[PDB]
Amino acid sequence: EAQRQFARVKLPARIRYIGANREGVDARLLDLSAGGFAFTASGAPIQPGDLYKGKMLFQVDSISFSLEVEFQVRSVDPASRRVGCEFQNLKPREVAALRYLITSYLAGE
Amino acid sequence: EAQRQFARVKLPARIRYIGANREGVDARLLDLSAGGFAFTASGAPIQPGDLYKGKMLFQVDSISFSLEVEFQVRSVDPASRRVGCEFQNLKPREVAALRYLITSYLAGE
Ligand SMILES: Nc1nc2c(ncn2[C@@H]2O[C@@H]3COP(=O)(O)O[C@H]4[C@@H](O)[C@H](n5cnc6c(=O)[nH]c(N)nc65)O[C@@H]4COP(=O)(O)O[C@H]3[C@H]2O)c(=O)[nH]1
Ligand SMILES: Nc1nc2c(ncn2[C@@H]2O[C@@H]3COP(=O)(O)O[C@H]4[C@@H](O)[C@H](n5cnc6c(=O)[nH]c(N)nc65)O[C@@H]4COP(=O)(O)O[C@H]3[C@H]2O)c(=O)[nH]1
Ligand SMILES: Nc1nc2c(ncn2[C@@H]2O[C@@H]3COP(=O)(O)O[C@H]4[C@@H](O)[C@H](n5cnc6c(=O)[nH]c(N)nc65)O[C@@H]4COP(=O)(O)O[C@H]3[C@H]2O)c(=O)[nH]1
Ligand SMILES: Nc1nc2c(ncn2[C@@H]2O[C@@H]3COP(=O)(O)O[C@H]4[C@@H](O)[C@H](n5cnc6c(=O)[nH]c(N)nc65)O[C@@H]4COP(=O)(O)O[C@H]3[C@H]2O)c(=O)[nH]1
């Protein structure tokens, strides 16, 4: 097994992006980390390697955070339709902020 | 002069609350800190000591943050209509998160 570079957490979170068939997607996140996220595809075709841009929202410490993110699909389980994604081109302070907030959430667990 | 307990910054930020005359307010923030904020009243009556609840939005490191805050008016300059406010009842992790983000903004300056 591989070490995950960023700890993952399950919290209230959502991704909104425009997908392949020009069909807007609104998906609850299965989990989130400073490196990426997962969600259940339940819809249009999606492939490993696909690049999307969207607005991600999540809540930590009663604060709602949202940012525009680009992501790359890293895996698609054709069975469960679980889609694993990696953020692309996040700025240093942005990644740092994500890490801080997720760590703060973890601290609460 | 008095030392400010929390550093203040000028960033894109907004407060939305329901004011005295039941008149909804949407005001850009003059500045923000982990302790409170200021805005120009330009409208209905408002007094030192007034308590309001609203949704505050601000942007740091390309991330948009919003939270429901209760605030107490600490000062009202009847001339410039500058209103200075103090957050009430923020949770420890919430204050810590605010301090972190504002410090991160300051670091960028
Ligand atoms: N390609 C890919 N798929 C991912 C990734 N994260 C989650 N998944 C998929 O999501 C399933 C379940 O993830 P899990 O709940 O965290 O639960 C996982 C996890 O807790 C653990 N696990 C398995 N392999 C690894 C690993 O290489 N590293 C770590 N840290 N945990 C693993 O075993 C459970 C299931 O393993 P899987 O059969 O692989 O089944 C995984 C896998 O199909 C990922 O970064 N890349
Ligand atoms: N929150 C979240 N982020 C995701 C997910 N899928 C991909 N990412 C993000 O994209 C990076 C690369 O994913 P990977 O190519 O599948 O490459 C993964 C994968 O090969 C493996 N891995 C980690 N966990 C599992 C697992 O539960 N099952 C399996 N089969 N592999 C895993 O370890 C590699 C690196 O893991 P990371 O360091 O965490 O790095 C991940 C992670 O930052 C996801 O389901 N949830
Ligand atoms: N009651 C109250 N009013 C506030 C507060 N913060 C800002 N104001 C009001 O906003 C005006 C300008 O604030 P400033 O731009 O930061 O610019 C300020 C600030 O840079 C500085 N200053 C004056 N007094 C103090 C002080 O006691 N502590 C600090 N740290 N700075 C002060 O002088 C400028 C103007 O002084 P002011 O005449 O008082 O005029 C102040 C004052 O009327 C506050 O925490 N409480
Ligand atoms: N971002 C922001 N927060 C505000 C403002 N007004 C009040 N607050 C928040 O509410 C606390 C108390 O404000 P104060 O009663 O006016 O009590 C103030 C006030 O008496 C004085 N003070 C600070 N700056 C100034 C200033 O520029 N001018 C004057 N006249 N007094 C100041 O120092 C006391 C404590 O300052 P703080 O520690 O900063 O603590 C402030 C601050 O956390 C504001 O305009 N902007």
Tab-separated table of C-alpha atoms and ligand atoms in Angstrom:
chain	number	residue	atom	x	y	z
A	1	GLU	CA	0.000	0.000	0.000
A	2	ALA	CA	1.034	3.602	-0.671
A	3	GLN	CA	1.330	6.351	1.915
A	4	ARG	CA	-1.137	9.167	1.290
A	5	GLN	CA	0.727	12.471	1.083
A	6	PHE	CA	-2.221	14.385	2.592
A	7	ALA	CA	-4.636	13.216	5.298
A	8	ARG	CA	-8.214	12.708	4.083
A	9	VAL	CA	-11.395	13.670	5.932
A	10	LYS	CA	-15.130	13.269	5.478
A	11	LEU	CA	-16.916	16.591	5.914
A	12	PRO	CA	-19.837	18.509	4.346
A	13	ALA	CA	-18.507	19.334	0.910
A	14	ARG	CA	-19.621	19.659	-2.687
A	15	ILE	CA	-18.064	19.963	-6.149
A	16	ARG	CA	-19.829	21.751	-9.037
A	17	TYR	CA	-18.292	21.446	-12.495
A	18	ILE	CA	-19.309	21.172	-16.134
A	19	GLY	CA	-18.756	17.594	-17.320
A	20	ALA	CA	-18.258	15.786	-20.629
A	21	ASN	CA	-21.738	15.882	-22.141
A	22	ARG	CA	-21.886	19.597	-21.262
A	23	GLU	CA	-23.996	18.311	-18.375
A	24	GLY	CA	-23.558	20.253	-15.140
A	25	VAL	CA	-22.598	18.143	-12.153
A	26	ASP	CA	-23.348	18.734	-8.484
A	27	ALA	CA	-21.750	16.043	-6.339
A	28	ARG	CA	-21.278	15.519	-2.610
A	29	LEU	CA	-17.667	14.650	-1.765
A	30	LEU	CA	-16.909	11.212	-0.344
A	31	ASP	CA	-13.724	12.621	1.175
A	32	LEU	CA	-11.341	15.562	0.854
A	33	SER	CA	-7.638	16.308	1.371
A	34	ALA	CA	-5.233	19.079	0.435
A	35	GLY	CA	-4.335	16.953	-2.571
A	36	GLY	CA	-7.764	16.115	-3.956
A	37	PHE	CA	-11.114	14.461	-3.398
A	38	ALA	CA	-13.502	11.684	-4.374
A	39	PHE	CA	-17.141	11.575	-5.441
A	40	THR	CA	-19.626	9.100	-6.910
A	41	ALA	CA	-20.023	9.763	-10.649
A	42	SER	CA	-23.639	8.542	-10.964
A	43	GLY	CA	-24.167	9.956	-14.469
A	44	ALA	CA	-22.315	10.921	-17.653
A	45	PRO	CA	-19.115	9.233	-18.923
A	46	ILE	CA	-15.863	10.150	-17.179
A	47	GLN	CA	-12.326	8.856	-17.769
A	48	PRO	CA	-9.068	8.765	-15.817
A	49	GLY	CA	-7.026	11.743	-16.973
A	50	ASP	CA	-10.026	14.007	-17.681
A	51	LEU	CA	-9.432	17.622	-16.679
A	52	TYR	CA	-12.245	19.686	-15.181
A	53	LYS	CA	-12.622	23.056	-13.520
A	54	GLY	CA	-15.250	23.814	-10.931
A	55	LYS	CA	-16.266	25.396	-7.682
A	56	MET	CA	-15.650	23.356	-4.557
A	57	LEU	CA	-17.378	24.125	-1.278
A	58	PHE	CA	-16.679	22.732	2.179
A	59	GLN	CA	-17.363	23.543	5.818
A	60	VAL	CA	-14.864	23.489	8.705
A	61	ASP	CA	-15.237	25.076	12.143
A	62	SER	CA	-18.614	26.607	11.136
A	63	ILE	CA	-16.851	28.425	8.304
A	64	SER	CA	-17.772	27.834	4.679
A	65	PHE	CA	-14.891	27.797	2.247
A	66	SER	CA	-15.150	27.817	-1.509
A	67	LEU	CA	-12.621	28.049	-4.278
A	68	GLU	CA	-12.348	27.539	-8.011
A	69	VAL	CA	-10.233	24.455	-8.589
A	70	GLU	CA	-8.886	22.604	-11.582
A	71	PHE	CA	-8.742	18.841	-11.087
A	72	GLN	CA	-7.488	15.772	-12.889
A	73	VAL	CA	-9.321	12.463	-12.619
A	74	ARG	CA	-6.830	9.908	-11.253
A	75	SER	CA	-9.052	6.834	-11.093
A	76	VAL	CA	-12.518	5.700	-12.034
A	77	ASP	CA	-13.900	2.492	-10.620
A	78	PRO	CA	-16.295	1.451	-13.415
A	79	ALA	CA	-18.190	-0.602	-10.822
A	80	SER	CA	-19.010	1.716	-7.912
A	81	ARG	CA	-18.507	4.790	-10.110
A	82	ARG	CA	-16.188	6.194	-7.428
A	83	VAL	CA	-14.120	8.968	-8.971
A	84	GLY	CA	-10.804	9.950	-7.401
A	85	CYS	CA	-9.389	13.361	-8.312
A	86	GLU	CA	-6.208	15.396	-7.799
A	87	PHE	CA	-6.114	19.191	-7.621
A	88	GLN	CA	-4.014	20.906	-10.262
A	89	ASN	CA	-2.171	24.226	-10.077
A	90	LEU	CA	-3.062	25.206	-6.534
A	91	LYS	CA	-0.999	28.140	-5.311
A	92	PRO	CA	1.350	27.555	-2.323
A	93	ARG	CA	-0.687	29.666	0.151
A	94	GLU	CA	-3.860	27.967	-1.054
A	95	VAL	CA	-2.485	24.490	-0.402
A	96	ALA	CA	-1.192	25.719	2.952
A	97	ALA	CA	-4.628	27.082	3.828
A	98	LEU	CA	-6.301	23.802	2.842
A	99	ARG	CA	-3.795	21.843	4.928
A	100	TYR	CA	-4.369	24.132	7.889
A	101	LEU	CA	-8.147	23.800	7.750
A	102	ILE	CA	-8.152	20.065	7.234
A	103	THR	CA	-5.652	19.618	10.058
A	104	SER	CA	-7.900	21.760	12.249
A	105	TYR	CA	-10.819	19.490	11.378
A	106	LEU	CA	-8.723	16.407	12.150
A	107	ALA	CA	-7.737	17.955	15.483
A	108	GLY	CA	-11.429	18.104	16.369
A	109	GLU	CA	-11.995	14.416	15.623
B	1	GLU	CA	-3.370	55.269	21.898
B	2	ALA	CA	-4.475	51.679	22.525
B	3	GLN	CA	-2.809	48.567	21.159
B	4	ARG	CA	-5.096	46.632	18.829
B	5	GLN	CA	-5.379	43.036	20.018
B	6	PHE	CA	-5.760	41.738	16.441
B	7	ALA	CA	-4.072	43.042	13.283
B	8	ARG	CA	-6.463	44.655	10.789
B	9	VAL	CA	-6.393	44.270	7.006
B	10	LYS	CA	-8.209	45.699	4.010
B	11	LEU	CA	-9.422	42.933	1.709
B	12	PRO	CA	-12.485	42.124	-0.442
B	13	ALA	CA	-15.165	41.549	2.156
B	14	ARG	CA	-18.851	42.114	2.769
B	15	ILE	CA	-21.325	41.979	5.661
B	16	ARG	CA	-25.038	41.206	5.144
B	17	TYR	CA	-27.357	41.656	8.116
B	18	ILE	CA	-30.885	42.772	8.930
B	19	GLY	CA	-30.764	46.225	10.536
B	20	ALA	CA	-32.984	48.353	12.774
B	21	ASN	CA	-35.752	49.414	10.403
B	22	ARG	CA	-36.012	45.774	9.270
B	23	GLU	CA	-34.011	47.081	6.315
B	24	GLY	CA	-31.508	44.594	4.908
B	25	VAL	CA	-27.953	45.867	4.728
B	26	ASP	CA	-25.202	44.906	2.302
B	27	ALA	CA	-21.972	46.702	3.158
B	28	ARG	CA	-18.380	46.473	1.954
B	29	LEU	CA	-15.941	46.222	4.870
B	30	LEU	CA	-13.492	49.065	5.442
B	31	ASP	CA	-11.231	46.647	7.307
B	32	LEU	CA	-11.307	43.279	9.062
B	33	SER	CA	-9.539	41.519	11.946
B	34	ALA	CA	-10.100	38.406	14.028
B	35	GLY	CA	-11.809	40.683	16.529
B	36	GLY	CA	-14.201	42.599	14.297
B	37	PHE	CA	-14.648	44.957	11.379
B	38	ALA	CA	-15.752	48.380	10.186
B	39	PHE	CA	-18.141	49.606	7.505
B	40	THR	CA	-19.794	52.849	6.403
B	41	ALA	CA	-23.401	52.927	7.653
B	42	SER	CA	-24.832	55.083	4.831
B	43	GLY	CA	-28.483	54.444	5.739
B	44	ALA	CA	-30.766	53.558	8.655
B	45	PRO	CA	-30.132	54.536	12.308
B	46	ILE	CA	-27.519	52.532	14.209
B	47	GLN	CA	-26.255	52.936	17.783
B	48	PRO	CA	-23.194	51.857	19.758
B	49	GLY	CA	-24.150	48.677	21.589
B	50	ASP	CA	-26.584	47.420	18.921
B	51	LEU	CA	-26.407	43.663	18.397
B	52	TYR	CA	-26.783	42.189	14.918
B	53	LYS	CA	-26.362	38.811	13.283
B	54	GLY	CA	-25.365	38.356	9.681
B	55	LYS	CA	-23.350	36.589	7.053
B	56	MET	CA	-19.832	37.862	6.497
B	57	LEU	CA	-17.869	37.050	3.364
B	58	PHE	CA	-14.195	37.632	2.625
B	59	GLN	CA	-11.502	36.449	0.235
B	60	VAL	CA	-7.942	35.381	1.113
B	61	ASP	CA	-5.500	33.411	-1.039
B	62	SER	CA	-8.158	32.997	-3.782
B	63	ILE	CA	-10.391	31.267	-1.242
B	64	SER	CA	-13.785	32.657	-0.299
B	65	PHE	CA	-14.728	32.335	3.337
B	66	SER	CA	-18.125	32.992	4.821
B	67	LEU	CA	-19.577	32.561	8.259
B	68	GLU	CA	-22.599	33.580	10.284
B	69	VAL	CA	-21.438	36.057	12.898
B	70	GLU	CA	-23.025	37.953	15.742
B	71	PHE	CA	-21.551	41.416	16.252
B	72	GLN	CA	-21.816	44.302	18.669
B	73	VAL	CA	-21.464	47.885	17.478
B	74	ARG	CA	-18.586	49.446	19.449
B	75	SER	CA	-18.551	52.924	17.930
B	76	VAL	CA	-20.492	55.060	15.511
B	77	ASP	CA	-18.981	58.245	14.176
B	78	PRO	CA	-22.132	60.313	13.525
B	79	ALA	CA	-20.101	62.341	11.017
B	80	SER	CA	-18.494	59.877	8.596
B	81	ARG	CA	-21.014	57.177	9.540
B	82	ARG	CA	-18.087	54.801	10.118
B	83	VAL	CA	-19.318	51.871	12.182
B	84	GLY	CA	-16.848	49.818	14.208
B	85	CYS	CA	-17.957	46.350	15.309
B	86	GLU	CA	-16.741	43.500	17.528
B	87	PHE	CA	-17.538	39.835	16.914
B	88	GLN	CA	-19.440	38.084	19.678
B	89	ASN	CA	-19.392	34.413	20.668
B	90	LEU	CA	-16.910	33.139	18.114
B	91	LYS	CA	-15.765	29.611	18.885
B	92	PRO	CA	-12.040	29.070	19.672
B	93	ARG	CA	-11.256	27.191	16.419
B	94	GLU	CA	-13.161	29.831	14.468
B	95	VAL	CA	-11.123	32.676	15.937
B	96	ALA	CA	-7.982	30.625	15.339
B	97	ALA	CA	-8.973	30.082	11.712
B	98	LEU	CA	-9.662	33.800	11.230
B	99	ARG	CA	-6.304	34.673	12.789
B	100	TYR	CA	-4.543	32.163	10.564
B	101	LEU	CA	-6.120	33.487	7.376
B	102	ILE	CA	-5.599	37.127	8.213
B	103	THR	CA	-1.992	36.442	9.184
B	104	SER	CA	-1.550	34.635	5.871
B	105	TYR	CA	-2.911	37.698	4.082
B	106	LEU	CA	-0.577	39.960	6.063
B	107	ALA	CA	2.338	37.690	5.155
B	108	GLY	CA	1.569	38.367	1.496
B	109	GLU	CA	1.648	42.146	1.939
C	1	LIG	N1	-6.708	4.538	-7.518
C	1	LIG	C1	-7.103	5.039	-6.226
C	1	LIG	N2	-8.205	4.561	-5.650
C	1	LIG	C2	-8.546	5.047	-4.447
C	1	LIG	C3	-7.777	6.026	-3.811
C	1	LIG	N3	-8.392	6.280	-2.635
C	1	LIG	C4	-9.494	5.517	-2.538
C	1	LIG	N4	-9.576	4.765	-3.648
C	1	LIG	C5	-10.600	3.804	-4.004
C	1	LIG	O1	-11.631	3.911	-3.058
C	1	LIG	C6	-11.768	2.674	-2.459
C	1	LIG	C7	-11.925	2.864	-1.041
C	1	LIG	O2	-11.141	3.800	-0.431
C	1	LIG	P1	-11.001	3.854	1.138
C	1	LIG	O3	-12.399	4.051	1.705
C	1	LIG	O4	-10.253	5.036	1.646
C	1	LIG	O5	-10.490	2.546	1.776
C	1	LIG	C8	-9.347	1.959	1.282
C	1	LIG	C9	-8.203	2.246	2.175
C	1	LIG	O6	-8.603	2.485	3.465
C	1	LIG	C10	-7.341	1.032	2.115
C	1	LIG	N5	-6.208	1.104	1.141
C	1	LIG	C11	-6.077	0.279	0.116
C	1	LIG	N6	-4.975	0.597	-0.583
C	1	LIG	C12	-4.398	1.634	0.021
C	1	LIG	C13	-3.261	2.383	-0.231
C	1	LIG	O7	-2.446	2.068	-1.346
C	1	LIG	N7	-2.945	3.402	0.571
C	1	LIG	C14	-3.702	3.698	1.624
C	1	LIG	N8	-3.343	4.760	2.436
C	1	LIG	N9	-4.815	2.997	1.893
C	1	LIG	C15	-5.180	1.972	1.115
C	1	LIG	O8	-8.123	-0.037	1.656
C	1	LIG	C16	-9.462	0.479	1.251
C	1	LIG	C17	-9.839	0.006	-0.045
C	1	LIG	O9	-8.849	-0.199	-1.052
C	1	LIG	P2	-9.206	-0.171	-2.580
C	1	LIG	O10	-9.503	-1.587	-2.933
C	1	LIG	O11	-8.060	0.236	-3.479
C	1	LIG	O12	-10.558	0.599	-2.874
C	1	LIG	C18	-10.457	1.994	-2.782
C	1	LIG	C19	-10.119	2.450	-4.018
C	1	LIG	O13	-10.799	1.714	-5.052
C	1	LIG	C20	-6.631	6.483	-4.468
C	1	LIG	O14	-5.825	7.422	-3.941
C	1	LIG	N10	-6.325	5.971	-5.662
C	2	LIG	N1	-9.070	12.941	-0.989
C	2	LIG	C1	-8.775	12.114	-2.144
C	2	LIG	N2	-7.720	12.409	-2.920
C	2	LIG	C2	-7.470	11.625	-4.010
C	2	LIG	C3	-8.283	10.539	-4.298
C	2	LIG	N3	-7.788	9.963	-5.436
C	2	LIG	C4	-6.709	10.653	-5.824
C	2	LIG	N4	-6.518	11.674	-4.962
C	2	LIG	C5	-5.445	12.653	-4.967
C	2	LIG	O1	-4.656	12.485	-6.122
C	2	LIG	C6	-3.429	11.900	-5.765
C	2	LIG	C7	-3.096	10.797	-6.670
C	2	LIG	O2	-3.960	9.743	-6.688
C	2	LIG	P1	-3.584	8.319	-7.304
C	2	LIG	O3	-3.081	8.589	-8.697
C	2	LIG	O4	-4.755	7.457	-7.318
C	2	LIG	O5	-2.383	7.731	-6.512
C	2	LIG	C8	-2.599	7.218	-5.258
C	2	LIG	C9	-2.863	5.772	-5.305
C	2	LIG	O6	-2.051	5.162	-6.242
C	2	LIG	C10	-2.505	5.302	-3.931
C	2	LIG	N5	-3.633	5.133	-2.948
C	2	LIG	C11	-3.910	5.921	-1.899
C	2	LIG	N6	-4.999	5.452	-1.257
C	2	LIG	C12	-5.414	4.355	-1.909
C	2	LIG	C13	-6.463	3.454	-1.742
C	2	LIG	O7	-7.369	3.616	-0.661
C	2	LIG	N7	-6.607	2.426	-2.597
C	2	LIG	C14	-5.766	2.261	-3.615
C	2	LIG	N8	-5.953	1.186	-4.483
C	2	LIG	N9	-4.751	3.112	-3.812
C	2	LIG	C15	-4.556	4.152	-2.979
C	2	LIG	O8	-1.575	6.211	-3.417
C	2	LIG	C16	-1.357	7.260	-4.442
C	2	LIG	C17	-1.187	8.522	-3.778
C	2	LIG	O9	-2.174	8.905	-2.817
C	2	LIG	P2	-2.304	10.430	-2.387
C	2	LIG	O10	-0.989	10.784	-1.806
C	2	LIG	O11	-3.365	10.603	-1.347
C	2	LIG	O12	-2.430	11.383	-3.646
C	2	LIG	C18	-3.665	11.397	-4.364
C	2	LIG	C19	-4.551	12.344	-3.854
C	2	LIG	O13	-3.813	13.517	-3.483
C	2	LIG	C20	-9.362	10.301	-3.439
C	2	LIG	O14	-10.181	9.278	-3.621
C	2	LIG	N10	-9.597	11.093	-2.373
C	3	LIG	N1	-13.868	53.918	18.722
C	3	LIG	C1	-13.029	53.335	17.707
C	3	LIG	N2	-12.850	53.984	16.557
C	3	LIG	C2	-12.064	53.416	15.631
C	3	LIG	C3	-11.448	52.180	15.854
C	3	LIG	N3	-10.736	51.908	14.740
C	3	LIG	C4	-10.902	52.906	13.854
C	3	LIG	N4	-11.711	53.823	14.411
C	3	LIG	C5	-12.189	55.062	13.833
C	3	LIG	O1	-11.809	55.076	12.482
C	3	LIG	C6	-11.018	56.192	12.290
C	3	LIG	C7	-9.892	55.822	11.475
C	3	LIG	O2	-9.282	54.628	11.731
C	3	LIG	P1	-7.867	54.286	11.128
C	3	LIG	O3	-7.991	54.371	9.615
C	3	LIG	O4	-7.425	52.883	11.360
C	3	LIG	O5	-6.758	55.294	11.496
C	3	LIG	C8	-6.572	55.634	12.818
C	3	LIG	C9	-5.398	54.919	13.365
C	3	LIG	O6	-4.495	54.586	12.388
C	3	LIG	C10	-4.783	55.859	14.343
C	3	LIG	N5	-5.192	55.652	15.767
C	3	LIG	C11	-5.819	56.569	16.483
C	3	LIG	N6	-6.065	56.093	17.714
C	3	LIG	C12	-5.572	54.858	17.776
C	3	LIG	C13	-5.524	53.889	18.764
C	3	LIG	O7	-6.085	54.157	20.036
C	3	LIG	N7	-4.959	52.707	18.509
C	3	LIG	C14	-4.424	52.451	17.319
C	3	LIG	N8	-3.843	51.215	17.090
C	3	LIG	N9	-4.460	53.366	16.335
C	3	LIG	C15	-5.021	54.563	16.537
C	3	LIG	O8	-5.224	57.155	14.041
C	3	LIG	C16	-6.260	57.078	12.971
C	3	LIG	C17	-7.424	57.837	13.309
C	3	LIG	O9	-7.848	57.937	14.667
C	3	LIG	P2	-9.338	58.251	15.048
C	3	LIG	O10	-9.398	59.733	15.178
C	3	LIG	O11	-9.763	57.711	16.395
C	3	LIG	O12	-10.347	57.919	13.874
C	3	LIG	C18	-10.589	56.550	13.695
C	3	LIG	C19	-11.652	56.228	14.480
C	3	LIG	O13	-12.642	57.273	14.476
C	3	LIG	C20	-11.675	51.553	17.084
C	3	LIG	O14	-11.130	50.364	17.395
C	3	LIG	N10	-12.462	52.154	17.979
C	4	LIG	N1	-11.310	45.480	12.316
C	4	LIG	C1	-11.984	46.377	13.234
C	4	LIG	N2	-12.311	45.947	14.463
C	4	LIG	C2	-12.957	46.804	15.307
C	4	LIG	C3	-13.258	48.096	14.903
C	4	LIG	N3	-13.902	48.700	15.948
C	4	LIG	C4	-13.981	47.825	16.957
C	4	LIG	N4	-13.416	46.663	16.566
C	4	LIG	C5	-13.237	45.453	17.349
C	4	LIG	O1	-13.883	45.594	18.593
C	4	LIG	C6	-12.917	45.773	19.598
C	4	LIG	C7	-13.285	46.882	20.482
C	4	LIG	O2	-13.378	48.114	19.905
C	4	LIG	P1	-13.393	49.471	20.745
C	4	LIG	O3	-14.477	49.308	21.778
C	4	LIG	O4	-13.657	50.599	19.867
C	4	LIG	O5	-12.056	49.589	21.530
C	4	LIG	C8	-10.913	49.930	20.853
C	4	LIG	C9	-10.685	51.382	20.877
C	4	LIG	O6	-11.014	51.903	22.114
C	4	LIG	C10	-9.215	51.513	20.640
C	4	LIG	N5	-8.770	51.809	19.233
C	4	LIG	C11	-8.171	50.962	18.384
C	4	LIG	N6	-7.931	51.588	17.214
C	4	LIG	C12	-8.384	52.846	17.325
C	4	LIG	C13	-8.431	53.949	16.477
C	4	LIG	O7	-7.897	53.856	15.166
C	4	LIG	N7	-8.969	55.104	16.909
C	4	LIG	C14	-9.474	55.207	18.135
C	4	LIG	N8	-10.029	56.420	18.542
C	4	LIG	N9	-9.455	54.164	18.975
C	4	LIG	C15	-8.918	52.989	18.598
C	4	LIG	O8	-8.622	50.323	21.072
C	4	LIG	C16	-9.704	49.434	21.560
C	4	LIG	C17	-9.383	48.080	21.201
C	4	LIG	O9	-9.044	47.818	19.838
C	4	LIG	P2	-9.119	46.330	19.280
C	4	LIG	O10	-8.167	45.556	20.109
C	4	LIG	O11	-8.687	46.274	17.850
C	4	LIG	O12	-10.520	45.661	19.590
C	4	LIG	C18	-11.656	46.086	18.835
C	4	LIG	C19	-11.818	45.333	17.673
C	4	LIG	O13	-11.498	43.964	17.960
C	4	LIG	C20	-12.884	48.465	13.606
C	4	LIG	O14	-13.111	49.682	13.138
C	4	LIG	N10	-12.254	47.600	12.785
